[PDB]
Specification:
2 copies of one chain form a homodimer. Chain A is mostly beta strands. The first copy, chain A, folds into 2 domains: 121 residues, Immunoglobulins (Immunoglobulin-like, Sandwich); 99 residues, Immunoglobulins (Immunoglobulin-like, Sandwich), CATH 2.60.40.10. Chain A contains no helices and 18 strands. The first copy, chain A, starts with a strand and ends in a 6-residue tail after the last strand. The complex binds a molecule of 4 linked components (NAG-NAG-BMA-FUC) (4 copies).
Amino acid sequence: QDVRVRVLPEVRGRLGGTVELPCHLLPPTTERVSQVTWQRLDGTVVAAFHPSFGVDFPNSQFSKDRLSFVRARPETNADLRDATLAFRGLRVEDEGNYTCEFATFPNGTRRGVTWLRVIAQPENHAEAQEVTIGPQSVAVARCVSTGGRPPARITWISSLGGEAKDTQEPGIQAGTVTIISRYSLVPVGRADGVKVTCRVEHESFEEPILLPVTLSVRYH
Amino acid sequence: QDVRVRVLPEVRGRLGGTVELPCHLLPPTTERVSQVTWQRLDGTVVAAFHPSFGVDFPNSQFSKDRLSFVRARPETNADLRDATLAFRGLRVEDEGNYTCEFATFPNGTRRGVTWLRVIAQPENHAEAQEVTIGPQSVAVARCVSTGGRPPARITWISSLGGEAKDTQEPGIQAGTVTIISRYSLVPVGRADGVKVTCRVEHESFEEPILLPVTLSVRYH
Ligand SMILES: *[C@@H]1O[C@H](CO[C@@H]2O[C@@H](C)[C@@H](O)[C@@H](O)[C@@H]2O)[C@@H](O[C@@H]2O[C@H](CO)[C@@H](O[C@@H]3O[C@H](CO)[C@@H](O)[C@H](O)[C@@H]3O)[C@H](O)[C@H]2NC(C)=O)[C@H](O)[C@H]1NC(C)=O
Ligand SMILES: *[C@@H]1O[C@H](CO[C@@H]2O[C@@H](C)[C@@H](O)[C@@H](O)[C@@H]2O)[C@@H](O[C@@H]2O[C@H](CO)[C@@H](O[C@@H]3O[C@H](CO)[C@@H](O)[C@H](O)[C@@H]3O)[C@H](O)[C@H]2NC(C)=O)[C@H](O)[C@H]1NC(C)=O
Ligand SMILES: *[C@@H]1O[C@H](CO[C@@H]2O[C@@H](C)[C@@H](O)[C@@H](O)[C@@H]2O)[C@@H](O[C@@H]2O[C@H](CO)[C@@H](O[C@@H]3O[C@H](CO)[C@@H](O)[C@H](O)[C@@H]3O)[C@H](O)[C@H]2NC(C)=O)[C@H](O)[C@H]1NC(C)=O
Ligand SMILES: *[C@@H]1O[C@H](CO[C@@H]2O[C@@H](C)[C@@H](O)[C@@H](O)[C@@H]2O)[C@@H](O[C@@H]2O[C@H](CO)[C@@H](O[C@@H]3O[C@H](CO)[C@@H](O)[C@H](O)[C@@H]3O)[C@H](O)[C@H]2NC(C)=O)[C@H](O)[C@H]1NC(C)=O
């Protein structure tokens, strides 16, 4: 894990979206570059670049349709020190640790490693459930952050001191998860009409999203 | 530590002598080779080979005077899969773990690692010390394996049950060690003329070397 190879430790990309993973051999340019290879941790080579032999993306799983080098030079940069790797149509399966390796000469190989995270932005909905008075604590409201990656975090902003209950469950999409949160309390008459807000946090949002809902109690 | 790179785990060479360290990328030949580099563990590159840029031995310590590739081809083998590295004028300082690395394309780098040991063959001498009768246990014989690497192992084959004492000490040559072994016993009259043998074992010898000596006691 060499300082003269510059990369970013972490990099995030939207499910089914695109990311560039940057990688550079930092100058001074005091060594020739022999070839560049992007490997996964398993060892599996993802993309490879060679000044004579050209480019290759030998894994059927990370094919040329999705992977590409950003390198822009007109077929002939006096040296290929920028090794930046673009992904498209991101898969959950691409979440991984990628390793950018420069075979230099006569200096040996230098590498840098970047963690690619695939985020999925969930879909959010809340509602009140209409309830009758009674001593049993029932769900008076629910909030659901569907198909998040990673799992979203729901909390309840309410003036009444009702217990929250939540649970996980698999998302529709491979490696997404839906979070279900139920707001329960003993239904009391003064509660009718009171706004109770669902507060859902997730990587993909600038900040917590708020889904306000108004409670509904029997016999106003 | 890849199976498709063939090397030898261990390799021994005489101080101030020569060794070849062999290294091959095993066929089938299903990948192009980009460049070959021999690194020490520290990382320090010892020798490097590149099909276009040529050869280099960039470390002042392992210079071209001593290092060389055995590779024989007339400047143009269709591929340079044999990466065998010759050393000469071996130094104690070269004892190390060397790593043979093939930058392949598009396949990544494969490597193999060989431990290079520098042996020094010691010089051996033994003698009896002449002694007078007396209750005090004195050295009646000594044996010295001078300037060994690694340290030699001396033992005594004798019919009399005398205690052995030995000690280390630095050798003349950097990273050699002299072993001194004294054969002591209470000098008894029947012992005169009795052969007592020095038995010294060391890597460099086919087997244990034997230095026989005849005891010398006062008043036969
Ligand atoms: C470098 O990678 C190449 C190609 O790798 C192939 O595809 C990638 C997406 C990955 O899935 C790789 O795992 C995959 O191999 C390798 O070439 C292949 O080498 C192997 C031998 O190591 C060949 O298998 C042999 O097949 C023959 C008969 O066809 C048998 O007789 C052998 O016993 C053996 O099973 C394979 O056919 C070959 N592929 C091609 C297109 O030639 C290469 O081995 C690898 N090299 C290194 C050093 O990693
Ligand atoms: C991708 O790689 C990153 C970072 O690199 C990590 O370090 C490397 C040098 C290797 O040794 C890798 O094995 C290692 O993953 C990973 O981030 C790290 O993930 C590990 C899980 O394997 C986390 O370890 C935890 O550490 C805490 C203490 O803080 C313990 O309580 C746990 O038991 C657990 O061991 C670690 O927190 C995390 N580090 C950072 C900075 O996020 C990553 O997991 C791996 N993932 C992917 C998707 O590629
Ligand atoms: C690959 O190795 C080359 C040459 O390495 C040199 O000799 C070997 C036997 C080893 O002892 C190496 O450690 C040694 O560097 C490296 O080239 C050298 O790069 C450094 C910068 O990393 C240069 O030092 C700079 O010097 C200038 C002024 O001269 C300062 O302004 C800088 O602040 C810095 O100190 C050094 O001069 C340069 N040598 C040559 C001949 O150009 C190279 O860095 C290295 N590359 C990698 C990726 O490892
Ligand atoms: C050169 O390298 C060899 C072999 O490779 C070794 O394994 C590598 C994968 C790395 O992890 C290296 O760190 C490691 O050296 C070395 O041979 C081994 O040396 C180590 C000392 O570092 C020995 O370890 C001992 O193990 C015993 C238990 O059996 C313990 O009681 C000791 O505490 C000690 O840790 C090990 O015996 C030895 N292995 C063999 C097969 O000989 C070598 O030391 C290193 N030396 C040189 C000159 O390059």
